[PDB]
Amino acid sequence: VGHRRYFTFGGGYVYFEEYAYSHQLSRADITTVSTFIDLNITMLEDHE
Amino acid sequence: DIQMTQSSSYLSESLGGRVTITCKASDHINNWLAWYQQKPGNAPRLLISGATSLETGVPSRFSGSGSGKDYTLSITSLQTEDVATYYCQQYWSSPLTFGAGTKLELKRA
Amino acid sequence: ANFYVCPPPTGATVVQFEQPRRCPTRPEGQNYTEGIAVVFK
Amino acid sequence: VQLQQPGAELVKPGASVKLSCKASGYTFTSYWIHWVKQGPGQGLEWIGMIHPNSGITHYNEKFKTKATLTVDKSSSTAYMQLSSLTSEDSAVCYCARGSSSGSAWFAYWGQGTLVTVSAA
Amino acid sequence: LWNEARKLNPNAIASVTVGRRVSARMLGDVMAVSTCVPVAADNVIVQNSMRISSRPGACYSRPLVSFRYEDQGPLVEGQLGENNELRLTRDAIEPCT
Amino acid sequence: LWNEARKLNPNAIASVTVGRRVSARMLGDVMAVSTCVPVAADNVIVQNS
């Protein structure tokens, strides 16, 4: 009971509830956390 | 677990009389006990909040006390409008446990 | 320190890991034309 | 401060039932809500407690499946879903508030719902 | 590595990823989260024995604990998880040796 | 970490390591691989139940 799962499908997700297809979703419809460590490396600007 | 053993199932007394209910705990609590009254036609009221603590809505005719495992409530000037059940209550450990109830009644039919 | 109590999460909130992000190749580099030079003042 | 309940529920024994309490006066989010069951003349028994702000439940050990708590913050409402009803479950159920002190001495209650689980 | 670590225990990965200290589970290919409520350090009791008399040869594999949410609320049972987390369920039994 | 992740599901590790999208299994201390055949997106049906 309480079964509800998202599965990756194409470029988006497919959402099932209680072992019955419910509907598709895009990637944008889900808040995205990040496992990435930012590194904002800029460059020595040109100087004359 | 914690068990409340309430001394008397009922306590009747004539008008303006003096009574003193009490009860016992199944494990030491450190004065974290409360006393309630409930008439049949209302949600139970509050008399004692902390083994010895009166509050608003209860005059000095009610008084609570106790220590260790034995706690008590002395009632003065018993009236016809105090007939109700009286409840020990603990708030030291879930599950919360209430007293069985003491029937405070009158010396009349 | 502190302790934490954690409810079992209902399916109310959903999160997903950010997908890999492309990042450009190195700059192409400058086209250097050799030569023989004479500098006059 | 007040808690509004249905006076009674005349619901057949067997299939589960729903119960509600509407909060008023205080801040519904910032205080614990406990629930206590008592039959006619019985010694009232604490059936559970719930934090509306967080949703963390705590059931009396004999009330995991008999009842199930719920909170709607939107309408300042507390809910029980009573599953596996019996005739004797017809009883007064009180929803009560405790102070910021979770001591839960239960100052202010509602009138309490005298559920009548019956087919009369 | 992050994809295949979150399948082991979503709690730690979700907490270190979101930023808060959250509790999470996996619904297939997504994580469902919920914020965890703090509890003051001084309001915990560790029970002395990890054994269970009604189950000979079996024992709780992490300590039994008791706590109170507010500084003076009631006392509730739990079990000590990893990284100060209190599970509300006393079920992490091992056959003890 | 890479040694002890490939034992969980060799497919992802082998694919991200070789460069292609391959299917792999472990034969003890080595990975046996085989290239995976692409399938067009529009030619799939998800059954309802």
Numbering used by the authors:
A (entry chain C): 635 to 682
B (entry chain L): 1 to 109
C (entry chain A): 111 to 151
D (entry chain H): 2 to 121
E (entry chain A): 538 to 634
F (entry chain C): 538 to 586
Relevant lines from the article:
To better understand the nature of these antibodies, we determined cryo–electron microscopic (cryo-EM) structures for Fab fragments of both mAbs in complex with the soluble ectodomain of HSV-1 gB in the postfusion state. The postfusion state of gB was selected for structural studies given the biochemically validated mAb binding and the poor stability of the prefusion state. The structures of each antibody complex revealed the basis of the observed, albeit weak, competition; both rAbs bound domain IV (DIV) of gB, but the binding site of each was adjacent but non-overlapping.
The additional rAbs bound gB with avidities ranging from equal to that of BMPC-23 (1.0) to much weaker (0.06).
